[PDB]
Design a protein around this ligand. Structure first.
Ligand SMILES: [K+]
Ligand SMILES: [K+]
Ligand SMILES: [K+]
Ligand SMILES: [Mg+2]
Ligand SMILES: [Mg+2]
Ligand SMILES: [Mg+2]
Ligand SMILES: [Mg+2]
Ligand SMILES: [Mg+2]
Ligand SMILES: [Mg+2]
Ligand SMILES: [Mg+2]
Ligand SMILES: [Mg+2]
Ligand SMILES: [Mg+2]
Ligand SMILES: [Mg+2]
Ligand SMILES: [Mg+2]
Ligand SMILES: [Mg+2]
Ligand SMILES: [Mg+2]
Ligand SMILES: [Mg+2]
Ligand SMILES: [Mg+2]
Ligand SMILES: [Mg+2]
Ligand SMILES: [Mg+2]
Ligand SMILES: [Mg+2]
Ligand SMILES: [Mg+2]
Ligand SMILES: [Mg+2]
Ligand SMILES: [Mg+2]
Ligand SMILES: [Mg+2]
Ligand SMILES: [Mg+2]
Ligand SMILES: [Mg+2]
Ligand SMILES: [Mg+2]
Ligand SMILES: [Mg+2]
Ligand SMILES: [Mg+2]
Ligand SMILES: [Mg+2]
Ligand SMILES: [Mg+2]
Ligand SMILES: [Mg+2]
Ligand SMILES: [Mg+2]
Ligand SMILES: [Mg+2]
Ligand SMILES: [Mg+2]
Ligand SMILES: [Mg+2]
Ligand SMILES: [Mg+2]
Ligand SMILES: [Mg+2]
Ligand SMILES: [Mg+2]
Ligand SMILES: [Mg+2]
Ligand SMILES: [Mg+2]
Ligand SMILES: [Mg+2]
Ligand code: NA
Ligand code: NA
Ligand SMILES: [Zn+2]
Lengths: 197, 97, 157, 68
RNA sequence: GGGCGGCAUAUCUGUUACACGACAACGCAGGUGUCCUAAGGCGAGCUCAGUGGGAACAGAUCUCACGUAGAACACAAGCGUAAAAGCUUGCUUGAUUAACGAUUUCCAGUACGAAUCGAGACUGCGAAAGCAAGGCCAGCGAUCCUUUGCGAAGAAUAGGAAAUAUGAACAAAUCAUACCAGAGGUGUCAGAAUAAUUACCACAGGGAUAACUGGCUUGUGGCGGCCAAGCGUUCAUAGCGACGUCGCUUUUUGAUCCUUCGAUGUCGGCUCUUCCUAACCUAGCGCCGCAGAAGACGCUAAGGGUUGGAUUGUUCACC
RNA sequence: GCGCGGGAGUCCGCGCACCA
RNA sequence: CCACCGGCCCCGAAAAUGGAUGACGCU
RNA sequence: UCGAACCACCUAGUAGCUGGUUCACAUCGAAGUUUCCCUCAGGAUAGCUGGUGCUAGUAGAAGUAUUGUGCGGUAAAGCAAAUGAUUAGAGGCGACCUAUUCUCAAACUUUAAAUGUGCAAACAAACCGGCCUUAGCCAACUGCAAGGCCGGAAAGAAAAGAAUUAGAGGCACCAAGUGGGCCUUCUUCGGUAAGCGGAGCAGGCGAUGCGGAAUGAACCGC
RNA sequence: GUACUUCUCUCGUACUGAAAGGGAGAUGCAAAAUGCAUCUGUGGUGUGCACACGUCAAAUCCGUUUGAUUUGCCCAACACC
């Protein structure tokens, strides 16, 4: 025997295959597994891992956010160079709060119809990953982006709302029911809003 | 316990904002009035054939009560309430002896 | 039976023999600022702003300074994790810690050596290990043995 | 019937199975709420001035870069 | 076991407790539901318990010297304190209010109780630096319901920086309600509104738990040994043996709760067999304080024997 | 808490009444 | 030749169905 | 059929209690402890466990040393040192004082271990000279305090016994069983004692065979 | 069963107060009891994939690989404002 106490606690849970049933997703996974194995770019490896990931971990992104980050990168770029291609492993959605945008080249798994119309009208192009693999096989001159995950209702609900320093929402259908005792100083006590950690 | 008949303390009124003299009285609970909302609900529930419908407290344990003093200012017609500790015999005396 | 605030502190909160008295003037004139290391040692003659008996003898970091008080952060293990507790004590119950005296001396010595090398001075000679071999020339040699008198002098009656 | 009252026999082993985790480093969660108020107010005025200086500095960098 | 008793049911000090912290018992020695307008706050001036030398009544008061606390701080205990935290005295009400600031103890890092560091108002004492929002550390209480205090008068051509709100078709005056802070109490003290009996008795279960056999133990009971102060007229030991001390047994009663509660038939007697020896008789020996007779104290030895009746259910007991 | 008696209180008797 | 104190052995050492260094045996 | 008849229905009445609960391999793998509860044959709550992951894969690591710097009142010791017990003689002078003398304390101590316990040991840090701001301190400031900007240096931690790692750190979500324990080594409290009752540290059985002690849950080896 | 359909209804894009009620951009100038002006834009700081610009190591079949690091922008995310 060999003393290997608590050795199973160093194992990590990682997904090695997709749970999706989409044949086009499977084709993309095949192509980018080949590219990641046979090239020396970190871009391909990151893209392959994100393609493997699940739907909840592939949050969508906003066209306005894309425009803002592209502008903040472009303000410090020489005028003799071309703007990078935005790349999102996920969905791109339109934004009504911003009406004027520059011409951008965007590659994504899926576009909403409004977002596609807005990009084309501004004067950009919508690309797919198979087109990207031919335009830039190693991912040179790209801009990898992710969508926002905090702000989801589930995240806002995570935790216990009755302990000091917590601001999570309780699971309740009647908004006016869980007030009074434990939430007001006049009713016995009030949950403390702040606590040093 | 003996307590003075008058106290000098901060008034707090916007027109005074200074220490003034107060008159000391002991608080006493008012009469339970009919047509109070809780009393109306209790009377409706008690009527009928059910019998006694609410608990009645029997096994008391305390032998004292907290003392509440009402302080009245002559300059400003305002009243303040102050709580003292529990005691068995509270008396107001200015004798100071 | 009883679990009061100061239970079981008969020998902990007591003065040493012939060392009674209130704090001296050196304590009053000591400067404490945010970010210093302090030792929390209760002074039983003050009885104001005394720390709880658990924190007697712990070392921490100052995070707050008031006219008469000091705020200290202390590590405390609870079950499976370590908590950072913030306690408020009067200034007479803390003292400056020397827990980094050796490390600070190490940095100063390195700076001095660096300056001498740039100035082209003469570096001091290096110490040699005592664990090496060599010739030993004895001055006094004695025989080690057990003698009869050793046993006779072991029966006190 | 009577039973066992109290013991601490296995508790140390349970606490070390997932280890006793160390403290959070000092540069995280260093909130200043509850500290001495007069010093807190004065520090807020300095931080407000620094933010305005940071915005001005970025504008100068942009203009210089455009001028090449 | 349960009952009776008692609170180990909320809570404080010393010890158990093993020199960080934590740690149980119907463990040990003790406390708590109060008390205080001063016994709270501050300034000043003094030094306590006791001892020694002296002064009419006087074998109470006055004076000098010594006096590290041997006194005192409401109460139990620990700690702390000497130009004080003790005693006397003078003035006072910081035991008020305190924008939902932060933290400690219990701890789930919830609440309650208690406590610590702060910011603002108005003050108290002090020449001043300063000290004080009770008496350091035990002395206390959720939802609902009841009940009290603050939304003073004046001003806005408008609801604003500045006027408490509602009773839903509208308006006035009563009435009711609402928002904030307290008070009336839950001692089974994180908080139901509660008297007996069953031998006429019932159900679900428990060997988590008693009554009877077994098992551990041997205080108690029963048997011995060692030393030798004395008894024995003399003489410690023929026969005994105090004060002490060491062991054995499980034929007595206690102590425990391991097996059995979908059941191990429970006192005594009658009948019948077998085993043990710590030996009453029967066989041999030794020794006495053994003249004989009758006996006492030992050793080998369990092969063979050990009764008939009155009273009592008896075992035991007595004749 | 309510009625009676023997500046107010305090005490004693009776007969009534009980949602923290 | 006397006191003292060690090793191994012996006495002190009495029970209930026939029996247990595991059995035979071993000097 | 009677300390409340019989028949049908409400009724498949409720049960924190007793009994049962149907295929195979594979990867992992416990608890009888904390707090609250008319709570003690039951629950909720934290801990132990599984699954799912997220994040820049050596990161903010450690049931272990070394060096430096803090904390302590058990074991031992003492009564010729304070408190409390306690035997005898001597000197001054029956009593008292004065030095001694014999024996002691879980709720006594001047002194004081071994095993412990807190902190630190250069990469969001620390060190050395410009500048900006503050309604912070001080009689003032170019003094102290605080938040930043610019620049330099950096055995990346020497030598003196001068660490080591089968040493990837951090962060979440969902949920099970368990909440009767018992034994041993050292330290112990009650009891004459117990295969008795109650605790502290650690290792085990429970949940586990295999090889040994003839036989044995816990002993020895593994 | 399949194919088709309008308004509407419902969850959400905004919350807060007991209620009468009210209701969230950035920058610059400035300091007005509803200030003024522009609209290609992360409110700020620290730590932070990929990409771009350099540099240094080790290996090399001499084509390039594997690691570090500088600077810029920093996506997701965490902490302090
Ligand atoms: K204790
Ligand atoms: K208003
Ligand atoms: K017995
Ligand atoms: Mg949102
Ligand atoms: Mg238990
Ligand atoms: Mg301790
Ligand atoms: Mg004084
Ligand atoms: Mg608060
Ligand atoms: Mg409280
Ligand atoms: Mg103040
Ligand atoms: Mg109350
Ligand atoms: Mg008014
Ligand atoms: Mg309770
Ligand atoms: Mg009868
Ligand atoms: Mg049993
Ligand atoms: Mg039975
Ligand atoms: Mg049976
Ligand atoms: Mg039978
Ligand atoms: Mg039978
Ligand atoms: Mg034999
Ligand atoms: Mg034998
Ligand atoms: Mg054998
Ligand atoms: Mg019949
Ligand atoms: Mg059924
Ligand atoms: Mg049935
Ligand atoms: Mg139950
Ligand atoms: Mg079963
Ligand atoms: Mg395993
Ligand atoms: Mg209850
Ligand atoms: Mg059971
Ligand atoms: Mg000792
Ligand atoms: Mg000693
Ligand atoms: Mg003594
Ligand atoms: Mg070295
Ligand atoms: Mg159970
Ligand atoms: Mg038991
Ligand atoms: Mg089991
Ligand atoms: Mg084993
Ligand atoms: Mg054997
Ligand atoms: Mg229409
Ligand atoms: Mg919403
Ligand atoms: Mg509304
Ligand atoms: Mg409001
Ligand atoms: Na209870
Ligand atoms: Na025995
Ligand atoms: Zn007034």
């Amino acid at each position: 025997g060999v003393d290997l106490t608590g050795i199973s606690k160093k194992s990590r849970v990682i997904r090695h295959h997709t749970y999706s049933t989409n044949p086009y997703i499977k084709l993309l996974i095949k192509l980018y597994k080949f590219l990641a194995k046979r090239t020396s770019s970190g871009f391909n490896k990151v893209v392959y891992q994100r393609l493997i990931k699940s739907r909840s971990n592939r949050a969508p992104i906003s066209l306005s956010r894309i425009a803002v980050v592209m502008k903040r990168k472009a303000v410090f770029t020489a005028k003799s160079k071309a703007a990078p291609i935005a790349v999102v492993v996920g969905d791109v959605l339109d934004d009504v709060r911003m009406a004027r945008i520059p011409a951008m080249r965007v590659c994504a798994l899926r576009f909403s119809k409004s977002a596609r119309q807005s990009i084309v009208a501004a004067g950009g192009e919508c690309l797919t990953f198979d087109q990207l693999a031919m335009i830039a096989p190693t991912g040179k001159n790209t801009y990898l982006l992710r969508g926002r995950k905090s702000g989801r209702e589930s995240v806002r609900h995570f935790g216990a709302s009755g302990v000091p320093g917590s601001h999570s929402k309780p699971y309740a259908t009647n908004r006016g029911k869980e007030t009074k005792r434990g939430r007001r100083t006049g009713r016995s006590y009030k949950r403390k809003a702040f606590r040093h950690v | 316990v003996n307590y003075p008949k008058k106290k000098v303390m901060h008034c707090g009124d916007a027109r005074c904002n200074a220490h003034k003299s107060f008159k000391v009285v002991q608080y006493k609970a008012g009469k339970a009035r009919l047509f109070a909302r809780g009393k109306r609900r209790y009377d409706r529930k008690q009527s009928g054939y059910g019998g006694q419908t609410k608990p009645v407290f029997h096994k008391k344990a305390k032998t004292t009560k907290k003392i509440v003093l009402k302080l009245q200012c002559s300059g400003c017609k305002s009243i303040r309430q102050v709580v003292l500790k529990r005691t068995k015999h509270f008396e107001l005396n200015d004798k100071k002896k | 039976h009883s679990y009061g605030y100061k239970s079981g502190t008969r020998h902990l909160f007591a003065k040493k023999f012939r060392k009674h008295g209130v704090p001296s003037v050196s304590t009053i004139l000591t400067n404490i600022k945010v970010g210093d290391y302090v030792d929390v040692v209760a002074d039983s003659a003050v009885r104001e702003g005394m720390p709880h008996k658990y924190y007697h003898g712990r070392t921490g970091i100052v995070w707050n300074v008031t006219p008469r008080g000091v705020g200290v952060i202390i590590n405390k293990p609870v079950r499976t994790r370590t908590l950072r507790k913030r306690i408020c004590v009067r200034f007479e119950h803390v003292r400056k810690s020397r827990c980094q005296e050796a490390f600070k001396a190490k940095e100063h010595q390195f700076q001095a050596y660096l300056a001498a090398k740039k100035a082209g001075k003469a570096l001091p000679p290096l110490q040699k290990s005592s664990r090496l071999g060599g010739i030993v020339r004895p001055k006094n040699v004695e025989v080690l043995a057990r003698r009869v008198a050793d046993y006779e002098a072991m029966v006190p009656y | 019937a009577k039973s066992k009252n109290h013991t601490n026999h296995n508790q140390s082993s349970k606490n070390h199975r997932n280890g006793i985790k160390g403290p959070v480093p000092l540069h995280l969660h260093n909130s200043k709420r509850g500290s001495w108020l007069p010093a807190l107010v004065n520090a807020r005025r300095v931080r407000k001035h620094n933010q305005k200086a940071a915005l001005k500095k970025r504008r100068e960098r942009i203009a210089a870069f455009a001028a090449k």
